[PDB]
C-alpha cells in the first residue's frame, strides 16, 4: 500500500515513512539507496522489484498563540512547516500525536510560509506587529466582540518627500526632548 | 557585513530516540538536561530577529523617491528600485542576490516532494527525517528591500535631516556643497567642477558592478556563514550512524533485536553519545551567534553614522574623506557603498 | 536525577548494595553531576562575555556623552545631542540623554549662489533663502532671517558656471560709510 | 508550590457516567476508577473488585458498617443479592475506622458529596476519600485513609447498596500529567490538566497559572502511521520430504538408512497432514514452534520395527532393539515419527 | 592592548591513544569527534 504513513519492516529495515513511486535508476545488483549523510532513502521492493521512497511522516512543531489569560481565554494553534491540508486530513482521520483539538470553523484556516494557522481569521489591514508569527505575518487580539486575527505587519506610516530642484524647508522653532537608555 | 544566521529549533526526543517509548522513557531520567538546549535555541532565534530589526528598521516612515530622476546630473538608477523587476530590486541588489546560493531556504515547505524526490533525497529531506528543522525569518527578503529603498530615498532628497527630526528637502547640488564643506574644502570647488564630479560619480558607479561581477568571490563572508551552518547541520546528522561503542547505531533495530532488561545498557550508551553530540552542536551555535551579534551591532552603528550623516573618524566609512554612503541588501547581510 | 543509577541520594544507595557494586553505581551519579557542572560553568562564561561587552559600551557612552558632547549620530539619543545625566540602577546604569529636535518648518525657496555683478557670492555658513520676493541669508537648523551682507557672503566665481544660479543685489556696510 | 506530577489521574472536563438507583452493571476497571456520590445519609455499603467475580480468582471486600470496615481480599463465590458464601483460601484481614463521614447542621440539606479514587499500580491497593458538605465546580482534593499491598488482578468494579423502607458519578483514571497548586498551609485549591486544551499545556509548559500575551512553542506533532506493513523476500526450493516419506523399500533396522537434508525451505504442514499417525513425541523442539527455528543440517533415518519397539525408541531406554540395532543419544533434540 | 595569542596544534590520535592500534580502532567508533577539534584549532590559528 502506498501514499500513506505506514510502519514498514522492509527486509529487516524497521522505520516509519511515506511510500510512493520513484524514477531512480537502480542497477540490477542494487537493493538499498542512501544519501550523502547516510540515511536509507529508496528501497527496491523485494517482491515488486520496483523503486519506493521513504519520507519523514510529518515532523513539525506546535506553537500556541494567545493574549494574556487575564484578558481572555481563547487560543489559536500554528503547526510549524507543514501545509495544513495534510494536518487537516490527519485531524479528520484522527492520527495526530497531540490529543488536544482546536476548532475548525472554515473561517480559521490560513496557509502561511511558516506552516498554516488554525483558530484565527484573515483581515487584510495593516497595523504594527504585536505577536510575531513568521514570514511577514502578525496576529493580535482586537475588538470586533473580541477575537484573534491574522494580518501582515505595516512597516510604518506612509510618507512622501516633496523634493524640488529649487525649494528648501527651514525650521522656525525647536523642541527639547529627554530620552533614556538602560 | 553579515547580520544574521539561519534559525534552527532541534528537538531532543525525535533526534535522540526515533519514536521509541522505552528510549524516551530512559531519556526522561536525565532530568531537564536537554531543556537548556531548547531554551538556548529559542534565544538564538529571537536574537537573530532582533539583529535584523536593529540593523534595518532605522526609520519610522517609508519615504518614496520622486517620479523624475534628475538630481543635478547625478546618476542613481543603479541603486534605486527598478519597477520592471517583479521583486522590485536594484541591479546591484540583483547581482548580490544571484551570487549567493543557500543550502536550506527554510521557507519552502519541502515536505511533500521528499517522497517525490525521484533521485536520492537531498540535505533538506535527510535532515528533516531526523527531527531537524529550520524556521523562516520574520521579515521577508522583500520588505527589507522596502526599508532599504526608504533609507535610500531619504538620503538623496533631504540630506541628513531625516535622521534627526522631520525631513526637510534640499537640492542635491546644495547637499553635495555642504558635504564638500564638511571636509575642509569650500563649496566653490563643487560649484565650479559640478560636471567633473558628476562624471566621476557615474564612472565609479558603473565600474563597481563590473568589479562585483568579474570576481570569483567578493561575497566570501556571507557564503562562509552559510557554509559553516550547513556543515554543522550535516555533521550533526552524520552522528546518528555512529556506533558509539554499542552493538548497533539504530534504535529501531536495536530495540527489535534485544530485550529491554539487557538492551538497557546499549540504549544508555546511545543516549550518552547522542546527548553529547547535541550539546556540542548547541555550544558551537551559541558561540557563532555571539560573533554574528557583534558584527550586526557594528553594521547598525555604521549605518546610523555613515548613512544618516557624514563621519569624521578616519577609515571608518571607507578610505579617504567621507562624503556619503548608500545601503544595499544582501542575503543575511548588508552592503555599503562608501 | 538518577542519571541511570539506582537512586539519586548517595547515602541511600550505600545501605542496600555491596561496596564494589555500590561503587559501580556511585560513578554514574558523579558523572551526571560533573556534566551538569560543566554545562553550568560554560553558560556562565558565555553570559559573562556578553555582559562585559555591554559594560564596555556603557563605559564609552558615559565618557563621551556625560564628559562632553558628541557629534556621532544616534549615539547619545535621537536628535542633536546636548547633555546626559547618569543614574544608578541595580546591576546597571541609566542615562538621561537631553537632545535638541527641530520643529515647524516652511517651504521657502533656495539658491546655490547669488551673482551681484559678475561674481558669485556664497553664504559663509547657512543657506540662501528667498521669502518669495526678497533674498536673505540664514542658518540651517534655525530660521533667523538676516539682510544679505558681504560679511556673510564671500566672493569667488564668475556668474557663468553655477547651474540654477539666481539674481539679486548684495549689500556691504563699507560703501555706506 | 505548583508541583507538576505524572501519575494515574482522572481526566479533566472528561465525561463521567452518572447513574441512578431504584441493575447495578459491573463496570470495567483500567488504570483506576474515580468515584463520586451525594446522598442524604447512606445508601452504599461495600465494594468488590477483580475479574470473573467467582470462587476461582481473587477478589476484594471492603464493606463498611455503622462503626468499622471489613477490608479483605478473598475468593468469594457468589451473593446475587450476607454478601459472600466462600472463604476457604482467603487471608488479608484488616480493620480500621469507617470510611463514611456524615455531618448535618440540624438539617438534611447538607448533602455531602463523596468523591473516591483508588488504584492498584504495582499492587498496593490505595484508598482515598474526601467529603464536601448536577456537579459542583469548586475544587476538592482527596485525603488518604489506607495503603495496603494487595497485588492481585483487577478488571471489574462493583458497588453494593443499602436498605430502605442521584449518585454514581463514576470515572476512570489514565496515565496523565497534572499540575497542582498547593496553598501556603498545604491544601490543594486548584488543578489543571496538561493534555486537554492548548491553553492547558500552554500553562503546564511554563508551570504558571497566569500566562502573559505571546506565542509559546509547546510540543511536537507527528502523524502516527495509518497501518503497518511487514514485507520480507520471496520463498522457494522445498526438500524431498515426499521422496523420503513415501519410499517403497525402507531398509531394515540392522542397517538404518540415513538421508541428508540440506539447501531447502522447510514446509512443515506436510509433517502434519501425512497419515493419521501413531506417535509424535518431540523432545528438544516444540512441535508447534518449529517453523520459527533455523537449522544448519538435518538427518532423517527411516526403518521398520514392531509396535513395542516404537515406544522403545526413546532417549535412555533398554531392550533388544535399543541396544543391538539402533541407539539414540540421551541429549537428542528433535521429533520422532511413527504411523 | 593584546593583539594575538599562541597557535596550538594538538592531535587527538596521539594525545588519546599513544601509538596503539587497538586504542585507535576503539576511538574510531566515536564518530568524527576529532576532525571538529582540528578544524576549530586551525580556525583559531588563522584568526590570530
Ligand atoms: C515653539 O514650540 C514650543 C513647544 O515646543 C512652544 O511653546 C508653547 O508655548 C505655548 C504658549 O505660547 C504654551 O502654552 C505651550 O505649553 C508651549 O510651552 C512655542 O510657543 C513655539 N514657539 C514658536 C515661535 O513657534
Ligand atoms: C545611468 O545609469 C544607468 C544604469 O543602468 C544607465 O542605464 C544604461 O542604459 C543603457 C541603454 O540606455 C544600457 O545599455 C546599460 O546597460 C545601462 O542599463 C544610464 O544610461 C545612465 N545614464 C546616465 C544619465 O548616466
Ligand atoms: C519677504 O520677506 C519679508 C521678511 O522681512 C516679509 O516682509 C515683511 O513685510 C512687512 C509688511 O508687509 C514689513 O513690515 C516687514 O518689515 C517685513 O519686511 C514678507 O512677508 C516676505 N514676502 C513673502 C512673499 O514671503
Ligand atoms: C542674472 O542677470 C544677468 C545680467 O545681470 C544675466 O546675464 C545675462 O545673460 C543673458 C543671456 O541669458 C545675456 O544676453 C546678457 O547679456 C547677460 O549676460 C543672467 O542670465 C541672469 N541670471 C538669471 C538666472 O536670470
Ligand atoms: C493555615 O492555618 C493557620 C492556623 O490555623 C491559619 O491562620 C489562622 O487564621 C485564622 C483566620 O482565618 C485565625 O483566626 C487564626 O488565629 C490563625 O491565625 C491560616 O489562615 C491557614 N491557611 C490558609 C487558610 O490558607
Ligand atoms: C514471488 O514468488 C511468487 C510465487 O512463486 C511469484 O508469483 C512472484 O512473482 C515472486 N515475486 C518476485 C518479485 O520474484
Ligand atoms: C504543500 O503545500 C500545498 C498545500 O496543499 C500543496 O501545493 C502541496 O501539498 C505542498 N506543496 C509543496 C510545494 O510541497
Ligand atoms: C482582503 O483580504 C483578503 C483575504 O481575506 C485578500 O485576499 C484580499 O487581497 C484583501 N484585499 C485588500 C484590498 O487588502
Ligand atoms: C529642476 O531642473 C531640471 C533642469 O531643468 C529639471 O530636469 C528638473 O525636473 C527640475 N526639478 C523639478 C522638481 O521639476
Ligand atoms: C512643501 O510643499 C509640499 C507640497 O505638496 C508639501 O507636501 C510639503 O509638506 C511642504 N513642505 C513642508 C511643509 O515642510
Ligand atoms: C462522553 O460521552 C459522550 C457521549 O454520550 C460524548 O459526546 C463525549 O464526547 C464524551 N466525553 C469526552 C470528553 O469525549
Ligand atoms: C462493624 O464491623 C466491625 C468490623 O470488625 C465489627 O467488629 C462490628 O461487629 C460490626 N458491627 C458494628 C455494629 O460495629
Ligand atoms: C487452598 O489451595 C490449595 C492449593 O493446592 C488446596 O490444596 C487447598 O485445598 C485449598 N483450600 C481450600 C480449597 O479450602
Ligand atoms: C489479569 O486478567 C487478564 C484478563 O483476565 C489477563 O490477561 C492477565 O494476564 C491477568 N493478570 C494476571 C497477573 O494474572
Ligand atoms: C506415494 O506415491 C504414490 C504415487 O507416486 C501415491 O499414489 C501414494 O499415495 C503415495 N503414498 C502415500 C502414503 O501417500
Ligand atoms: C539407502 O538405500 C539406498 C538404496 O538401497 C542405498 O543406495 C543407500 O546407500 C542407502 N543409504 C544408507 C544405507 O545410508
- Whether the Cβ atoms of residue D86 and residue D191 lie closer than 8 Å to each other: no
By C-alpha distance, which of A80, A111, A114 is closest to A98?
Answer: A80
Pairing of strands A13-18, D169-172: unpaired
Contact A63 D217 (CB under 8 A): yes
d(C-alpha A155, C-alpha A160), whole Å: 14
Q: Which of B18, B49, B115 sits opposite A20 (nearest CB)?
A: B115
Considering Cα of B285, then B291, then B295, then B300, what sign does the dihedral take? positive
By C-alpha distance, which of A126, A119, A128, A114 is closest to A101?
Answer: A119
CA distance C58 to chain A (A): 9
Contact A171 C141 (CB under 8 A): yes
Calculate the alpha carbon distances from C130 to B136, B177, C125, C137 in Å.
53, 19, 16, 8
d(C-alpha B69, C-alpha B175), whole Å: 16
Contact D222 A58 (CB under 8 A): yes
Q: Which grid cell is A89?
A: 486530513
Q: Is D185 touching ligand 5 by the criterion CB < 6 Å?
A: yes
- C106 interface with A at CB cutoff 8 Å: yes
C118 Cα: distance to centroid of ligand 4 (angstroms): 10
- What strand order describes the sheet that includes D156-159? D27-28, D156-159, D47-50, D59-61, D71-74, D91-94
Calculate the alpha carbon distances from C134 to B68, C137, C167 in Å.
29, 10, 11
d(C-alpha A125, C-alpha A152), whole Å: 7
Calculate the alpha carbon distances from D267 to D231, D235, D270, D279, D292 in Å.
20, 11, 7, 20, 11
- B155 interface with E at CB cutoff 8 Å: no
Q: Which of B164, B168, B290 sits opposite C49 (nearest CB)?
A: B290
Contact A36 B123 (CB under 8 A): yes
3-state secondary structure chain B: CECCCCEECCCHHHHHCCCCHHHHHHHHCCCCCCHHHHHHHHHHHHHHHHHHHHHHCCCCEECCCCCCCCECCECCCCCCCCCCCCCCCCHHHHHHHHCCCCCCCCCCCCCCCCCCCCCCCCHHHHHHCCCCCEECCCCCCCHHHHHHHHHHHHHHHHCCHHHCCCCCCCCHHHHHHHHHHCCCCCCHHHHHCHHHHHHHHHHHHHHHHHHHHHCCCCCHHHHHHHHHHHHHHHHHHHHHHCCCCCCCCCHHHHHHHCCHHHHHHHHHHHHHHHHHHHHHHHHHHHHHHHHHHHHHHHHHHHHHHHHCCCCCCCCCCCCCCCCCCEEEEECCEEEEEC
CA distance B232 to chain C (A): 20
- Whether the Cβ atoms of residue B20 and residue B131 lie closer than 8 Å to each other: no
d(C-alpha D198, C-alpha D210), whole Å: 14
Q: Could you give phi then psi for residue B304, rounded to 5 degrees?
A: -60, -30
Considering Cα of B273, then B275, then B280, then B281, what sign does the dihedral take? positive
Q: Is D88 touching ligand 13 by the criterion CB < 6 Å?
A: yes
Contact B138 A81 (CB under 8 A): no
Q: Is D257 touching ligand 16 by the criterion CB < 6 Å?
A: yes
Q: What is the experimental resolution, given in Å to one decimal place? A: 3.3
- Whether the Cβ atoms of residue B16 and residue B279 lie closer than 8 Å to each other: no
d(C-alpha B294, C-alpha B107), whole Å: 26
Strands, E, within E1-48: which ranges?
none
Q: Could you give phi then psi for residue D10, rounded to 5 degrees?
A: -70, 125
By C-alpha distance, which of A54, A58, A119 is closest to A87?
Answer: A58
Residues lining ligand 9, CB < 6 A?
A 164-165; B 68, 70
Q: Which grid cell is A3?
A: 501514499
Q: How many CA atoms lie within 13 A of B234 on its CB side?
A: 15
Q: Which grid cell is A130?
A: 504585536
d(C-alpha D215, C-alpha A77), whole Å: 10
d(C-alpha B289, C-alpha A97), whole Å: 33
D83 Cα: distance to centroid of ligand 12 (angstroms): 15
- The C-alpha R_g of chain C, in whole angstroms, comes to 37
Calculate the alpha carbon distances from D68 to D71, D79, D100, D146 in Å.
10, 21, 9, 13
Ligand closest to CA D237: 6
SS3 D310: helix
By C-alpha distance, which of C128, C99, C134, C96 is closest to C113?
Answer: C128
Block residue for cell numbers 525649494: A167
- Whether the Cβ atoms of residue C79 and residue A141 lie closer than 8 Å to each other: no
The residue whose CB lies within 8 Å of the most ligand 13 atoms, and thus the one to mutate among D55, D56, D89, D91, is D89
By C-alpha distance, which of B244, B287, B289, B239 is closest to B266?
Answer: B244
Q: Which grid cell is B145?
A: 528591500
d(C-alpha A71, C-alpha B124), whole Å: 41
Query: CB neighbours (10 Å) of residue D5?
Result: 11
Ligand closest to CA A85: 7
Contact B245 E26 (CB under 8 A): yes
Q: Which of C96, C98, C107 sits opposite A169 (nearest CB)?
A: C107
Q: Whose CA is nearest to atom 25 of ligand 2?
A: B75
d(C-alpha A115, C-alpha A63), whole Å: 10
SS3 A156: coil
Instruction: State the chains in contact with C (3 or more Cβ–Cβ pairs under 8 Å).
Output: A, B
Structure letter (DSSP) for residue D253: G
d(C-alpha A57, C-alpha A66), whole Å: 28
Buried b (16+ CB within 10 A) or exposed e, A36-65: ebebbbbbbeeeeeebbbbbbbbbbbbbbb
Calculate the alpha carbon distances from B307 to B280, B323, B336, C70, D269 in Å.
40, 10, 9, 17, 88
Q: Is D68 touching ligand 12 by the criterion CB < 6 Å?
A: yes
Helix axis angle, B194-214 to B91-98, nearest 10°: 20
Torsion region of D124: left, alpha or beta (phi above 0 gives left; psi -120 to 50 gives alpha): left
- E26 interface with B at CB cutoff 8 Å: yes
d(C-alpha D8, C-alpha D33), whole Å: 10
d(C-alpha C78, C-alpha E25), whole Å: 63
Contact A165 B171 (CB under 8 A): yes
Q: Which residues fall within 8 angstroms of residue B258, CB to CB, at 6 or more apart?
A: B247, B266
The DSSP annotation for D48-116 comes to EEESTTSTTS-EEE--B-SS-B-EEEE----------S--TT-EEEE--S-S-----SSSTT---EEEE
- Whether the Cβ atoms of residue D150 and residue D92 lie closer than 8 Å to each other: yes
Q: Which residues fall within 8 angstroms of residue D336, CB to CB, at 6 or more apart?
A: D279, D280, D281, D282, D283, D313
Helix (H) or strand (E) holding C58: helix C19-61
Amino acid at each position: 500500500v502506498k501514499n500513506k504513513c505506514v510502519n514498514f519492516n522492509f527486509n529487516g529495515l524497521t522505520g516509519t515513512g511515506v511510500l510512493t513511486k520513484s524514477n531512480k535508476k537502480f542497477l540490477p545488483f542494487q537493493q538499498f539507496g542512501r544519501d550523502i549523510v547516510d540515511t536509507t532513502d529508496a528501497v527496491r521492493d523485494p517482491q515488486t522489484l520496483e523503486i519506493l521512497d521513504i519520507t519523514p511522516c510529518s515532523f513539525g512543531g506546535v506553537s500556541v498563540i494567545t493574549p494574556g489569560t487575564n484578558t481572555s481565554n481563547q487560543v489559536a494553534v500554528l503547526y510549524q512547516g507543514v501545509n495544513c491540508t495534510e494536518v487537516s486530513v490527519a485531524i479528520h482521520a484522527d492520527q495526530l500525536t497531540p490529543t488536544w483539538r482546536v476548532y475548525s470553523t472554515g473561517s480559521n484556516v490560513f496557509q502561511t510560509r511558516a506552516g498554516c494557522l488554525i483558530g484565527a481569521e484573515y483581515v487584510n489591514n495593516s497595523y504594527e506587529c504585536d505577536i510575531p508569527i513568521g514570514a511577514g505575518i502578525c496576529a493580535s487580539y482586537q475588538t470586533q466582540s473580541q477575537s484573534i486575527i491574522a494580518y501582515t505587519m505595516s512597516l510604518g506610516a506612509e510618507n512622501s518627500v516633496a523634493y524640488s530642484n529649487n525649494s528648501i524647508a527651514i525650521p522656525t522653532n525647536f523642541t527639547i526632548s529627554v530620552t533614556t537608555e538602560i | 557585513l553579515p547580520v544574521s544566521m539561519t534559525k534552527t529549533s532541534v528537538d531532543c526526543t525525535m533526534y535522540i530516540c526515533g519514536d521509541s517509548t522505552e528510549c524516551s522513557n530512559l531519556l526522561l531520567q536525565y532530568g531537564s538536561f536537554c531543556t537548556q538546549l531548547k531554551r538556548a535555541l529559542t534565544g538564538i532565534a529571537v536574537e537573530q530577529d532582533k539583529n535584523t530589526q536593529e540593523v534595518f528598521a532605522q526609520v519610522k516612515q517609508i519615504y518614496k523617491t520622486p517620479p523624475i530622476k534628475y538630481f543635478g546630473g547625478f546618476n542613481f538608477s543603479q541603486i534605486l528600485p527598478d519597477p520592471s523587476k517583479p521583486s522590485k530590486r536594484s541591479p546591484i541588489e540583483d547581482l548580490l542576490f544571484n551570487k549567493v546560493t543557500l543550502a536550506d531556504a527554510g521557507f519552502i515547505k519541502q515536505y511533500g516532494d521528499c517522497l517525490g524526490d525521484i533521485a536520492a533525497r537531498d540535505l533538506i529531506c535527510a535532515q528533516k527525517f531526523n527531527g531537524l528543522t529550520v524556521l523562516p525569518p520574520l521579515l521577508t527578503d522583500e520588505m527589507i528591500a522596502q526599508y532599504t529603498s526608504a533609507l535610500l530615498a531619504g538620503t538623496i532628497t533631504s540630506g541628513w535631516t531625516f535622521g534627526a527630526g522631520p525631513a526637510l528637502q534640499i537640492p542635491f547640488p546644495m547637499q553635495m556643497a555642504y558635504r564638500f564643506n564638511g571636509i575642509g574644502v569650500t563649496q566653490n570647488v563643487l560649484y565650479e567642477n559640478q560636471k567633473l564630479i558628476a562624471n566621476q560619480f557615474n564612472s565609479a558607479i558603473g565600474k563597481i558592478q563590473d568589479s562585483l561581477f568579474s570576481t570569483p568571490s567578493a561575497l566570501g563572508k556571507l557564503q562562509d556563514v552559510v557554509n559553516h551552518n550547513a556543515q554543522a547541520l550535516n555533521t550533526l546528522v552524520k552522528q546518528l550512524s555512529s556506533k558509539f561503542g554499542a552493538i548497533s547505531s539504530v534504535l529501531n533495530d536495536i530495540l527489535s533485536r534485544l530485550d529491554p532488561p539487557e538492551a538497557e545498557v546499549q540504549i544508555d550508551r546511545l543516549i550518552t553519545g547522542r546527548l553529547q553530540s547535541l550539546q556540542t552542536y548547541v555550544t558551537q551555535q551559541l558561540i557563532r551567534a555571539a560573533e554574528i551579534r557583534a558584527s550586526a551591532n557594528l553594521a547598525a552603528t555604521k549605518m546610523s553614522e555613515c548613512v544618516l550623516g557624514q563621519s569624521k573618524r578616519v577609515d571608518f566609512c571607507g578610505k579617504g574623506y567621507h562624503l556619503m554612503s548608500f545601503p544595499q541588501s544582501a542575503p543575511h547581510g548588508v552592503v555599503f557603498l562608501h | 536525577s538518577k542519571f541511570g543509577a539506582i537512586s539519586s541520594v548517595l547515602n541511600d544507595i550505600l545501605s542496600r548494595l555491596d561496596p564494589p557494586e555500590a561503587e559501580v553505581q556511585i560513578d554514574r551519579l558523579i558523572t551526571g553531576r560533573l556534566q551538569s557542572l560543566q554545562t553550568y560553568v560554560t553558560q556562565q562564561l558565555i553570559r559573562a562575555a556578553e555582559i562585559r561587552a555591554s559594560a564596555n559600551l556603557a563605559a564609552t557612552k558615559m565618557s563621551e556623552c556625560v564628559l562632553g558632547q558628541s557629534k556621532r549620530v544616534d549615539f547619545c539619543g535621537k536628535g542633536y545631542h546636548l547633555m546626559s545625566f547618569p543614574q544608578s540602577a541595580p546591576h546597571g546604569v541609566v542615562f538621561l540623554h537631553v537632545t535638541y529636535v527641530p520643529a515647524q518648518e516652511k517651504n521657502f525657496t533656495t539658491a546655490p549662489a547669488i551673482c551681484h555683478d559678475g561674481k558669485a557670492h556664497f553664504p559663509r555658513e547657512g543657506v540662501f533663502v528667498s521669502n518669495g520676493t526678497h533674498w536673505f541669508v540664514t542658518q540651517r537648523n534655525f530660521y533667523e532671517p538676516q539682510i544679505i551682507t558681504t560679511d556673510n557672503t564671500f566672493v569667488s566665481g564668475n556668474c557663468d558656471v553655477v547651474i540654477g544660479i539666481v539674481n539679486n543685489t548684495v549689500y556691504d556696510p563699507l560703501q555706506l560709510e | 508550590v505548583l508541583h507538576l506530577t505524572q501519575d494515574l489521574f482522572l481526566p479533566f472536563f472528561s465525561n463521567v457516567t452518572w447513574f441512578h438507583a431504584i441493575d447495578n452493571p459491573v463496570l470495567p476497571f483500567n488504570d483506576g476508577v474515580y468515584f463520586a456520590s451525594t446522598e442524604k445519609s447512606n445508601i452504599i455499603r461495600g465494594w468488590i473488585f477483580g475479574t470473573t467475580l467467582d470462587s476461582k480468582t481473587q477478589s476484594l471486600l471492603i464493606v463498611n458498617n455503622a462503626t468499622n470496615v471489613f477490608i479483605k481480599v478473598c475468593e468469594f463465590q457468589f451473593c446475587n443479592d450476607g454478601v459472600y458464601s466462600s472463604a476457604n483460601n482467603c487471608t488479608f484481614e484488616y480493620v480500621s475506622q469507617p470510611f463514611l463521614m456524615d455531618l448535618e447542621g440540624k438539617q438534611g440539606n447538607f448533602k455531602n458529596l463523596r468523591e473516591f479514587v483508588f488504584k492498584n499500580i504495582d499492587g498496593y491497593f490505595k484508598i482515598y476519600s474526601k467529603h464536601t458538605p448536577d456537579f459542583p465546580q469548586g475544587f476538592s482534593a482527596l485525603e488518604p485513609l489506607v495503603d495496603l499491598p494487595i497485588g492481585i488482578n483487577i478488571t471489574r468494579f462493583q458497588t453494593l447498596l443499602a436498605l430502605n423502607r442521584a449518585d454514581y458519578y463514576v470515572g476512570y483514571l489514565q496515565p496523565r500529567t497534572f499540575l497542582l497548586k498547593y496553598n501556603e498551609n498545604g491544601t490543594i485549591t486548584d488543578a489543571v490538566d496538561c493534555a486537554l486544551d492548548p491553553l492547558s499545556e500552554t500553562k503546564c509548559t511554563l508551570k504558571s497559572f497566569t500566562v502573559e500575551k505571546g506565542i509559546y512553542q509547546t510540543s511536537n506533532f507527528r502523524v502516527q502511521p495509518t497501518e503497518s506493513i511487514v514485507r520480507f523476500p520471496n520463498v522457494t526450493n522445498l526438500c524431498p520430504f515426499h521422496e523420503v516419506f513415501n519410499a517403497t523399500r525402507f531398509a531394515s533396522v540392522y542397517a538404518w538408512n540415513r538421508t541428508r537434508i540440506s539447501n531447502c525451505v522447510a514446509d512443515y504442514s506436510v509433517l502434519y497432514n501425512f497419515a493419521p499417525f501413531f506417535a509424535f513425541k518431540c523432545y528438544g523442539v516444540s512441535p508447534t514452534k518449529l517453523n520459527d527455528l533455523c537449522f544448519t543440517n538435518v538427518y532423517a533415518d527411516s526403518f521398520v520395527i514392531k509396535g513395542n519397539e516404537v515406544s522403545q525408541i526413546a532417549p535412555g531406554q533398554t531392550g533388544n532393539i535399543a541396544d543391538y540395532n539402533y541407539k539414540l543419544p540421551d541429549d537428542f533434540t528433535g521429533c520422532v515419527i511413527a504411523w
